[PDB]
Amino acid sequence: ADVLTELPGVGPSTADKLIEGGYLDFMKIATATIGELTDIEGISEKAAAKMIMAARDLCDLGFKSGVELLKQRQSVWRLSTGSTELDTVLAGGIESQSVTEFAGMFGSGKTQIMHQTCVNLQMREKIFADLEGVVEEELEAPKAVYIDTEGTFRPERVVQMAEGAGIDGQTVLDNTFVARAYNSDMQMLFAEKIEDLIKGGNNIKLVIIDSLTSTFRNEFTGRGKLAERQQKLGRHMATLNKLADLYNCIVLVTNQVAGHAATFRFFLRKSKGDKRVAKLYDSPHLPDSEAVFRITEKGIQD
Ligand SMILES: Nc1ncnc2c1ncn2[C@@H]1O[C@H](COP(=O)(O)OP(=O)(O)NP(=O)(O)O)[C@@H](O)[C@H]1O
Ligand SMILES: [Mg+2]
Ligand SMILES: [Mg+2]
């Protein structure tokens, strides 16, 4: 919560050094390590360790039980994919505070789904949030971040899907940030820079990395230095998982295939005609199931 001066032991000066260093929220200080904190101007370990321990207090990061376990879960909001069967398989839609992956072969529809989610994010009938754990002012003016890795982002497809949904295409475009990444370094940097958008008043609620693995697969072709690949990709994933937890946003990624973390995993396959099949083969509380949907001029439906 923006007002760092409330942090016992933290004055206006210290606080200044903080907001600069990237800490503007209590949670980010509470979940920080003495290292990443002392790496700032004049912040000693005693001062670093103390505020850190104090931020945890403010946020009440302790042991929870009984009904309190159900409260933490109500903070997770979901987004509709546009498909009824798909949302039912996700028990609502795509979850915030998690990374969900859509893997599949060429033309299976991974990119189409990413575009649709930017459109649905701008319609509150598409957003399913529990009011007991998500105050609507937190969902106000939601913005998306689309890190394009192959250059497949299509402004016209979003406008078309927006028409199909019954809203203004230009509106979706105004509330969507697109960053073209030409390599793994750029992909990773863009993801670390999302914190800057939020510091700039932008309520980033949807982060898309399309695709998550093509650059890594391009820069580490030799299956000898396959360990350096997993290490770099491993850091990228922790950054993504952390920003989904900290800013209560959903993280969406695509993967082309013919291993890395992610809480929900789907296999997408072409079927007859405009039909498609999405199979959930991995999640912590949902069973493996399949969903049939279509891709059309309107976008994703059924
Ligand atoms: N405007 C549109 N109207 C109807 N169908 C469309 C439209 N745009 C794209 N499609 C369909 O979407 C399919 C391709 O979707 P796409 O999301 O790009 O696949 P993909 O998973 O991203 N594969 P890849 O690009 O190799 O990573 C096409 O082959 C079209 O049939
Ligand atoms: Mg999470
Ligand atoms: Mg694609």
Numbering used by the authors: 2 to 259, 279 to 322
Study authors write:
The structures of EcRecA1 in complex with a series of DNA molecules have shed light on the exact mechanism of homologous DNA-strand exchange. These right-handed helical recombinase assemblies are classic allosteric systems equipped with two functional sites: one located at the subunit interface for binding and hydrolyzing ATP and the other near the filament axis for binding DNA and promoting strand exchange. The series of crystal structures of M. maripaludis RadA presented here further suggest the conservation of an allosteric switch in the ATPase centre which controls the conformational status of DNA-interacting loops.
The second set of MmRadA–AMPPNP structures were determined using crystals in the presence of 0.1–0.4 M NaCl or RbCl or 0.1–0.3 M KCl or NH4Cl. These conditions were selected because they did not appear to provide adequate cationic stabilization to trap the protein in its ATPase-active conformation. There was no electron density for 19 residues from Ala260 to Val278. As such, the catalyzing effect of the monovalent cations seen in the ATPase-active conformation is lost in this second set of MmRadA structures. Compared with the ATPase-active filaments of MmRadA, the filament pitch is slightly longer (108.5 Å). ATP hydrolysis would almost certainly lead to the collapse of this stabilizing bridge and result in mobility in loop 2 and hence lower affinity for DNA.
